[PDB]
Amino acid sequence: MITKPDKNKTRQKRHRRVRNKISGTAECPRLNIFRSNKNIYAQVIDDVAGVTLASASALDKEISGGTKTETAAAVGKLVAERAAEKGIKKVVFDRGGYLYHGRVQALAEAARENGLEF
Amino acid sequence: SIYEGDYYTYKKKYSENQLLREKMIIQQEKEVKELATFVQKAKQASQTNHALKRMGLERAIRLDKKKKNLTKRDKVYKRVKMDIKPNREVARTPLKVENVTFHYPGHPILYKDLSFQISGKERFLVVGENGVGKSTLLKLLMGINIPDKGKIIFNDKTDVAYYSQELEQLDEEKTILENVKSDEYTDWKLRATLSNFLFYDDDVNKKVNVLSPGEKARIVLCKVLLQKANLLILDQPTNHLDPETQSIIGANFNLFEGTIIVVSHNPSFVEQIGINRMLILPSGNIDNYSPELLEYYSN
Amino acid sequence: MRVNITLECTSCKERNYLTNKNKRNNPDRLEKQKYCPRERKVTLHRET
Amino acid sequence: LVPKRVKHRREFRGKMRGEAKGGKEVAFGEWGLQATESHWITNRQIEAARIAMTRYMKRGGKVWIKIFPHKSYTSKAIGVRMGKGKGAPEGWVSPVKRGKIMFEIAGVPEEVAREALRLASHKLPVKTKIVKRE
Amino acid sequence: NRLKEKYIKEVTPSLVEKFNYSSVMQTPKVDKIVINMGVGDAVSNAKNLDKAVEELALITGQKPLITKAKKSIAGFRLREGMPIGAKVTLRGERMYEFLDKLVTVSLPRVRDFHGVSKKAFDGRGNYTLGIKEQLIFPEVDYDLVDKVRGMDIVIVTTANTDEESRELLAQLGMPFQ
Amino acid sequence: SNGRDSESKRLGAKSADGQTVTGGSILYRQRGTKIYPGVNVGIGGDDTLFAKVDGVVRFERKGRDKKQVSVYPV
Amino acid sequence: MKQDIHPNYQPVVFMDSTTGFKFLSGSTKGSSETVEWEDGNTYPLLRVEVTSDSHPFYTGRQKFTQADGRVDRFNKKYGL
RNA sequence: UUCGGAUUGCAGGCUGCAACUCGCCUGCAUGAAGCCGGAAUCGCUAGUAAUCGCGGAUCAGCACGCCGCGGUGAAUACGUUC
RNA sequence: GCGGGGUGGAGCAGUCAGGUAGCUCGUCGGGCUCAUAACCCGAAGGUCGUAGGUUCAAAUCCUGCCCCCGCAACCA
RNA sequence: GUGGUGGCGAUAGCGAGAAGGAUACACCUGUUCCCAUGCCGAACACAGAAGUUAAGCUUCUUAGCGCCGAUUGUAGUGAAGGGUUUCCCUUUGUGAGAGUAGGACGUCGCCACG
RNA sequence: GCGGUCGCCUCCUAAAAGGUAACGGAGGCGCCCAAAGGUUCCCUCAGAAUGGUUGGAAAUCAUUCGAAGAGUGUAAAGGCAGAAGGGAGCUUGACUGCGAGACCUACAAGUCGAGCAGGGACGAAAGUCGGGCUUAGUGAUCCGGUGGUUCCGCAUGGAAGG
RNA sequence: UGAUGGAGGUAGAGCACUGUUUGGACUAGGGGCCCAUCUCGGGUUACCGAAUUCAGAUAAACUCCGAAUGCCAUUCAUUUA
Numbered sequence A: 001m002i003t004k005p006d007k008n009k010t011r012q013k014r015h016r017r018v019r020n021k022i023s024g025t026a027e028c029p030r031l032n033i034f035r036s037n038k039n040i041y042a043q044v045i046d047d048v049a050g051v052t053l054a055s056a057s058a059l060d061k062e063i064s065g066g067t068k069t070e071t072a073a074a075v076g077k078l079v080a081e082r083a084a085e086k087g088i089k090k091v092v093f094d095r096g097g098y099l100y101h102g103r104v105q106a107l108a109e110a111a112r113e114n115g116l117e118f
Numbered sequence B: 001s002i003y004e005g006d007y008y009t010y011k012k013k014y015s016e017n018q019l020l021r022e023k024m025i026i027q028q029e030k031e032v033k034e035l036a037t038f039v040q041k042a043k044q045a046s047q048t049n050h051a052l053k054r055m056g057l058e059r060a061i062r063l064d065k066k067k068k069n070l071t072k073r074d075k076v077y078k079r080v081k082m083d084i085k086p087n088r089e090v091a092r093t094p095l096k097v098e099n100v101t102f103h104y105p106g107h108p109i110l111y112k113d114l115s116f117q118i119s120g121k122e123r124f125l126v127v128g129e130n131g132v133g134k135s136t137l138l139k140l141l142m143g144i145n146i147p148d149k150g151k152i153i154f155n156d157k158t159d160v161a162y163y164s165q166e167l168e169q170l171d172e173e174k175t176i177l178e179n180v181k182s183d184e185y186t187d188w189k190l191r192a193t194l195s196n197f198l199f200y201d202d203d204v205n206k207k208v209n210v211l212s213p214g215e216k217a218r219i220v221l222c223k224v225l226l227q228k229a230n231l232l233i234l235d236q237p238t239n240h241l242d243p244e245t246q247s248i249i250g251a252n253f254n255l256f257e258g259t260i261i262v263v264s265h266n267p268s269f270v271e272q273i274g275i276n277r278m279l280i281l282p283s284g285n286i287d288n289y290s291p292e293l294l295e296y297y298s299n
Numbered sequence C: 001m002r003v004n005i006t007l008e009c010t011s012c013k014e015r016n017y018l019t020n021k022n023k024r025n026n027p028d029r030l031e032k033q034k035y036c037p038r039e040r041k042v043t044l045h046r047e048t
Numbered sequence D: 001l002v003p004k005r006v007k008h009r010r011e012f013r014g015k016m017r018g019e020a021k022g023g024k025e026v027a028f029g030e031w032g033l034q035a036t037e038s039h040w041i042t043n044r045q046i047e048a049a050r051i052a053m054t055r056y057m058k059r060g061g062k063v064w065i066k067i068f069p070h071k072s073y074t075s076k077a078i079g080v081r082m083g084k085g086k087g088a089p090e091g092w093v094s095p096v097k098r099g100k101i102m103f104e105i106a107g108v109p110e111e112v113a114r115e116a117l118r119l120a121s122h123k124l125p126v127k128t129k130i131v132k133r134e
Numbered sequence E: 001n002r003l004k005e006k007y008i009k010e011v012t013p014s015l016v017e018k019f020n021y022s023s024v025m026q027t028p029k030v031d032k033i034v035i036n037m038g039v040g041d042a043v044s045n046a047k048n049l050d051k052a053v054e055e056l057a058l059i060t061g062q063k064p065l066i067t068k069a070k071k072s073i074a075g076f077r078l079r080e081g082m083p084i085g086a087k088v089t090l091r092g093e094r095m096y097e098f099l100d101k102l103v104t105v106s107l108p109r110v111r112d113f114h115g116v117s118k119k120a121f122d123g124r125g126n127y128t129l130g131i132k133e134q135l136i137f138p139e140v141d142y143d144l145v146d147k148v149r150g151m152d153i154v155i156v157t158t159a160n161t162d163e164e165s166r167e168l169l170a171q172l173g174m175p176f177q
Numbered sequence F: 001s002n003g004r005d006s007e008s009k010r011l012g013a014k015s016a017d018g019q020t021v022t023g024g025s026i027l028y029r030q031r032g033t034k035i036y037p038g039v040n041v042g043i044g045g046d047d048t049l050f051a052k053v054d055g056v057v058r059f060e061r062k063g064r065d066k067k068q069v070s071v072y073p074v
Numbered sequence G: 001m002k003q004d005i006h007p008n009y010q011p012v013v014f015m016d017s018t019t020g021f022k023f024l025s026g027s028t029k030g031s032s033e034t035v036e037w038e039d040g041n042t043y044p045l046l047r048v049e050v051t052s053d054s055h056p057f058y059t060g061r062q063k064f065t066q067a068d069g070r071v072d073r074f075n076k077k078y079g080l
Numbered sequence H: 001u002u003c004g005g006a007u008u009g010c011a012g013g014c015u016g017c018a019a020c021u022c023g024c025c026u027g028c029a030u031g032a033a034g035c036c037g038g039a040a041u042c043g044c045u046a047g048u049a050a051u052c053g054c055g056g057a058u059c060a061g062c063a064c065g066c067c068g069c070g071g072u073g074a075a076u077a078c079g080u081u082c
Numbered sequence I: 001g002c003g004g005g006g007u008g009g010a011g012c013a014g015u016c017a018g019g020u021a022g023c024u025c026g027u028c029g030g031g032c033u034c035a036u037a038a039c040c041c042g043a044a045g046g047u048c049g050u051a052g053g054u055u056c057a058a059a060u061c062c063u064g065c066c067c068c069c070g071c072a073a074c075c076a
Numbered sequence J: 001g002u003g004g005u006g007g008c009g010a011u012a013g014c015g016a017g018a019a020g021g022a023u024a025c026a027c028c029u030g031u032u033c034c035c036a037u038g039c040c041g042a043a044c045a046c047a048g049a050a051g052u053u054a055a056g057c058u059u060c061u062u063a064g065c066g067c068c069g070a071u072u073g074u075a076g077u078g079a080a081g082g083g084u085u086u087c088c089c090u091u092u093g094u095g096a097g098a099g100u101a102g103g104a105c106g107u108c109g110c111c112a113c114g
Numbered sequence K: 001g002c003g004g005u006c007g008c009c010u011c012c013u014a015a016a017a018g019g020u021a022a023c024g025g026a027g028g029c030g031c032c033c034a035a036a037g038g039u040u041c042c043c044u045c046a047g048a049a050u051g052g053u054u055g056g057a058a059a060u061c062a063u064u065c066g067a068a069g070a071g072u073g074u075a076a077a078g079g080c081a082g083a084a085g086g087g088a089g090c091u092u093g094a095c096u097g098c099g100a101g102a103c104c105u106a107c108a109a110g111u112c113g114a115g116c117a118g119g120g121a122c123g124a125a126a127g128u129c130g131g132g133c134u135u136a137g138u139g140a141u142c143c144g145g146u147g148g149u150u151c152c153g154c155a156u157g158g159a160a161g162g
Numbered sequence L: 001u002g003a004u005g006g007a008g009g010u011a012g013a014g015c016a017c018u019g020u021u022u023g024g025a026c027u028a029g030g031g032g033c034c035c036a037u038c039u040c041g042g043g044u045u046a047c048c049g050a051a052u053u054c055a056g057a058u059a060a061a062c063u064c065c066g067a068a069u070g071c072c073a074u075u076c077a078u079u080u081a
C-alpha cells in the first residue's frame, strides 16, 4: 500500500501561488501554459473578462509534429503569431505551475522570438 | 609593564604588586559586606522601627556607591594541566635497535652498527650537540627514515607517540579543533582537554596558522596526550614553552608510567624527568645517567 | 557580543554606512557590496 | 470542592442577572432542588447540604451536585486599609442564578426525597423548590 | 534482473489468478525498499555512525542519507538534528537485485536462521524484516566490523492487504516461519 | 507586581466605506492582516492598509470568512 | 544516480557451490574469478556454499537428527 | 600463551547393598582467577633451608593432612643497640 | 514579605570566574595488642534538594518548584 | 462528451457506491539526451507509445457527516416609565444564539478537440 | 512612614469605532540574527494507530489516519497552511537622495506610505527587495571624540578655531 | 432626524478551541491477594483508573456565533444654524 499524488493536483497547488501575482488584463493578457504527457497547450486569457483571446496546441494540425520539445516550440510560434494577428504584443507568462526548464522554456522562447513581448 | 633590573627583580616587584592589590580588594569587600550586613538587618526589622528603616535606606545608598567603585580582582591566568597515562602496559623490551647504520645520501655516516635496547618505564636521554643526528635517530625509530643497515623492532605491547622538533605535525590551514580531531574521541572530550591546554571556547576555531609557536606546541602535546601511548618519543618538548609550562611538562612526565625517549638541551627539564640512561652521540655510548653528563658535554 | 560598526568605502575611504555585527559570529571585518553616494556606484565597503 | 487548577488566581466578583443559562431541567436524578433566587454558593454550603441529604437518604440512591464552585473570592484582613492590590484568594463560590437545579437525587421513594431535599435547602442560602423529573 | 524476471513471469500471473484481478494493473508490486539503520551510538562517538554508514553503503550500493533527530531528547542525550540513523532507498533494478541477494546469500548466513517473521506486517500490505547483525552480507568481510550492528529493511509494496503482500513476498522467496 | 501597560496604538479603521480618499491615505491600522488589501490598496510594513490611488473606499468579504478593502476611482 | 558518490557497483554471477545453481545479480564486491554467461557476457563470479536451493528449509527436508531422548539413551547404555 | 588447571558437559573405571545429598579415578570437551602479591607476618645456621619423589598408619573405597625414608642441595652469622 | 542554606553518616570546601567531586571526623574489612584505645593498610559511601532551560559540556550559569533556618507581618 | 481556464460564501465540500476512456487526461515504457535526488529517473526533467481503466480524472446515485437556513417563540437591548432598587417589572422599537421547517451531491462564462 | 512603583511592549478591566482610571488582574523589554535579511525555485505540520536490531513511553524507518490541534528567535494579542512555517541556489535593498498623501498628536516626537531619480540583488519574465509575521529592544539639549567637507577664516595669505 | 453602506466581537448565547467541571459506558494502565516466581501469565475487588464516548454544566483575561446601541461616511433627503 502506497499512494502516488496526482501530478496535476500538485501542479495546481503550485499554480495557485504563481497566479497570486500573475494575472491577465486586456492590454497585458495572461499566457497560460498546460502540459500533458502527450501534448502542450498555450492560451492567452483576459482574466478581467475571463475569456481566452487566442490559443494553440499540438492538435492544431498546423504543427507538423516531432519531438515534444520542438512541438512545444511550434506551439509557441503559432500562438505568438495568432496573438499578433489579434493585436496582442505584451503578455505575462503563466508557467502553469511547471518548472521553467524544458518544454515550457522552449515554448516561451519560441513565443518571444515570434514577437510576443515578455 | 617595564621594570628595571633582571628577571628575578621583575618577579619580586610583580609578586609584591599583586599582593598589595589583593589586600586592597579584601578590605573593599569587607566594607561592602559590613554595609550589606546592616542593610539586611534593617530590611528584616519590623516596619514599626522607623529609625532603623531610615538608616537602612541611608546605608543602602552608601552600599550602592561602594559596589560601583569596588575593584575587580583580575582572574589569575590558568596553568596547563596534563594527565598522561598509558592505555596498555610496557614490556621489558619496548624497543630493539640492532646494528643500525644510516647516512643521508651524500653525507658521512652518522652512526655505524648502532645497537641499543630499552628496558621499559625507562627515562632514555639521547644526548649530543647540534647537527649530530639526535633528531635523525628519532625519525629513524618512527619510520620516517628507513635504516641503511640493521633493524628496529618494537614489541607488540609498545605504542609510540612522537613529538617532532620543528612542529611539522599540524595543518596550518585547519583549525585547532580540526587538528586534534580523532576517531576515538568525541567533541566534548576534545574541548575539555583543549581547555586543560588553555584553549577556551571559540579559541578552538582559530586557524593554526595564526597561533604562536608556543600555542602550537601545546596542540602537538595535546595530540601526544590523546594517543595514550606507552612509549613517548619527544624531541625537545620544552622548546617554545613558557617557563611555567615547562616545569609542568617536566613534572608530569616524571610521573609518567611509561618509557620516555627524550631529547632536550634544557638542563632543568631533564632533571625533573629524572633520566636513567643517556645515549651519547656521535660516539654511541649507552650510559647510566648522572652528573657525568657534564663530562661528556665537556668532552 | 553584538556591537555597532561602520562600513567604510575602500575606494574613497568614506564612512558611508552604520550597522552592527556579532563579534563572536563574525570575528573578521565585515565586507559588503554597498552603493557609495559620493562615487554613485556600488563599491566594496569594509568595517573599520 | 475546589478546582484542581485555576488559570488566574484572582477573579472578578461578576454580576448575576436573569435566569441561569443551562441546567434548569433535571438531568440524572428523579428529583431536583431548583433555586428560586440568585446568589453565591460556597463549597462549604454545597458540602453541608450534600452531607445532610446523604445522611437522611441512608446511603440509598444517588446524589448529583449540578453546581461547582469555579469562582474564587478574595478578602482583606482586619486592620488593612484600602489599596495595595487585590486580596489573597479566600474561598470558592458558584454563582447560582434562579432556575438552576443545584442538586438531583434518585433511587429513593418520593417522601424520603422530599425530606432530604428540604434539609439540604435549609443549609443553602437561596430560597428553593422541589422539581420532579419530566 | 533475475528477480524481476521471476516476478513478471511467474509471480504476476499467479497473483492475478489467486486474487482474481480484473486488470493486470491491479497486480501488487514491490514499490520500494527502505533499509534503515538506527544508530544511537553516534552520540557517544560519531565514528560509530560513520562506520555504520560505510557498511550500509557497501551493502546497498547507494550512499545512505544520514537522517537526523527531529527532536532533542535528554533521555538519550540526544540534541535535535544530531545525525543519528541512516537510510537508503532502492527502486527498480537495484531494488530487485538487493532483494534477490537477501533471499539467497545474506539470509542463510544468519546464525541459526529459523526463517523470517510472519507477523511483521503493518496491516496495509507492507512488510519489514529486522536483521539483528551484519556480516551476513558478503561485502562486510567479517573483519572490517569493529562493532557489530543490525538494521531494519522496510519492503513497501502496492498491496492493500497483508495477505497479498505475504503471497508476493513468498513467491519472490521469503523464509516465513 | 502588576501596574504596567503600554500606550494604546489607536488601531482600527481610519476611513469609512463609501468615503472618497486621496492616494496614500491610511484605511485601516492592524496587527497582522485582520483585513486584506484589495484593489488599489497596499499593505504597509506593519500591516497598515492604505489607498494607492484616489477613490471611494469599499470593505468587502474575501470569500467565506475574510475581509478586504478596495479603493475604486470614479 | 549521482556520479562519483555511490560505491562501485558491478554485475556479478553467483553459483551455489554445493549444488551449482546459478543466479545473476549486482553487488559491490568483486571476485577475481570470472565466468561467461548467456547473452555471451562475462562477469566476475562469486562462489557461495549455501543458497536458497541449498538451504534445507527451502527444499523442505532437514539434515539435523534432532538429538536423542534420555529414555532411549538409558535403554541403549544398559541394554534394556 | 603450547603458562595456569579452577569450574562445567558428556562418556567411563573401580570399591561397595548402595557414590543424589556425598567417594576416588580416567578420556574427550571447556579453559576460570592468577603477570609474584599492602599493612603485617612465618621457618630455617648444613646434608640444614629450598626442592624431588618413595613408603606406611587409619583404610571396602577415599589425604593437598600425619608419620617416616631417601635424591639434589645452597645463602648468611659483621655483631647483641634494638 | 526580607535574607540565609540543601554536595557521601556528620562538619565543610568547591560555586563567583562551565570541563577534573574533594578536606576533617566517621563507618566497613584487615593488621598491631593478652585485650581495648591510639596507630598502620585497604574499601565502601554522593551522579551535588528537585524539575526544566543555556551550553560542545553544568555541583558551578538561568527559571521554577519543595524542604530547613533566622527575621518581619504595623507604627501616633 | 471530454480537456484546458476563470467568477460566484462548500447550496461548489467530504463520505459511500456505480459507470467510462473514441478522442482527450491519465496512469504507463524507459534514462541517451538537457535536467535531478542533502540516497533513490520515487519526485522534478527528458525521450516514447507495449498495456490498462486498476487508481487518479470525468459522469452518475446517495443527505451519512460537513454546509446553507425561513417562520414562531425567547434572551439581550435603544427610548420612555415603575418598584419592595446587589435586582426586578411595564410600554415602545429592535431582536439574536440555540432548536427547527426546509435547501442542497453546484452554478455562471471562455477556449480546443468532438 | 515601611514595602511597592517611575520609561517602553502585549492582554483583560474597556461598557462590539477610537480613547478611557485605580498602590486593578496578568506578563514581557533595555535584545538577537551575516542569516533568523533579499530574491528565484521547491516543500508542508503536531500527534495517533500498525509493523519493525540495538531501542526502552519516547532516538531513526515505512503505510495510513490526520486543517492545524505544529511552527512562526524572544511576552501576549492579532495574523499566517495560496504561507509570514520549512529547504536549497545566488546574493547584501539591513541601498543613496527623497517623498504626494495619510494616521497619531498639547509640544517635542512617533507611525505608514504609493511614487520619482541614482546604482544594484534575485528572476526567463512578470515582478519583489529602503531588514526580520506585526506591535518592545530606548534617551532631548548642552559638552566632547572620530571621519568627510568646493563653507567661514577679525588688515591680507595661512593658521588657530568654528 | 431619516435612508443607504460600512468598521468592530460587547450584552445574550454557545461549547467549535482553551481553561474549570459533573455523572454514566468502556478501558490502556496502576494497585494489594493467591497460584507460579526466573516474578513469570493469570483471576480478583461493582480497588484506583488515563484516553475515547454518551449525557450535563462553566468562563474578565474561552468563542462555532452574535445583537440593541453607539461610531465612521455619503456632492443623499427634511429641518435647523
Ligand SMILES: Nc1ncnc2c1ncn2[C@@H]1O[C@H](COP(=O)(O)OP(=O)(O)OP(=O)(O)O)[C@@H](O)[C@H]1O
Residues within 6 Å of the ligand: B104, B105, B107, B128, B129, B130, B131, B132, B133, B134, B135, B136, B137, B165
Ligand atoms: N633531510 C636531510 N638531508 C640531508 N642532510 C640532513 C638531513 N637531515 C639532517 N641532515 C643532516 O644530519 C645531520 C644531523 O641530523 P639531525 O637533524 O638529527 O641533527 P640534531 O641531532 O637534531 O641537532 P639539533 O636538534 O641540536 O639541531 C645535520 O648536519 C644535518 O645537516
Ligand SMILES: [K+]
Residues within 6 Å of the ligand: D121, D122, D123, D124, D125, D126, D127, D128
Ligand atoms: K434556603
Ligand SMILES: [K+]
Residues within 6 Å of the ligand: H019, H022, H023
Ligand atoms: K558419595
Ligand SMILES: [K+]
Residues within 6 Å of the ligand: H059
Ligand atoms: K588407603
Ligand SMILES: [K+]
Residues within 6 Å of the ligand: none
Ligand atoms: K516515468
Ligand SMILES: [K+]
Residues within 6 Å of the ligand: J053, J055
Ligand atoms: K480510472
Ligand SMILES: [K+]
Residues within 6 Å of the ligand: J105
Ligand atoms: K453535498
Ligand SMILES: [K+]
Residues within 6 Å of the ligand: none
Ligand atoms: K534564502
Ligand SMILES: [K+]
Residues within 6 Å of the ligand: L015
Ligand atoms: K468547551
Ligand SMILES: [K+]
Residues within 6 Å of the ligand: none
Ligand atoms: K466575554
Ligand SMILES: [Mg+2]
Residues within 6 Å of the ligand: B134, B135, B136, B165, B235
Ligand atoms: Mg634535533
Ligand SMILES: [Mg+2]
Residues within 6 Å of the ligand: F006, F007, F008, F009
Ligand atoms: Mg494595549
Ligand SMILES: [Mg+2]
Residues within 6 Å of the ligand: F045
Ligand atoms: Mg519592519
Ligand SMILES: [Mg+2]
Residues within 6 Å of the ligand: H035
Ligand atoms: Mg609473563
Ligand SMILES: [Mg+2]
Residues within 6 Å of the ligand: none
Ligand atoms: Mg640452632
Ligand SMILES: [Mg+2]
Residues within 6 Å of the ligand: none
Ligand atoms: Mg629430605
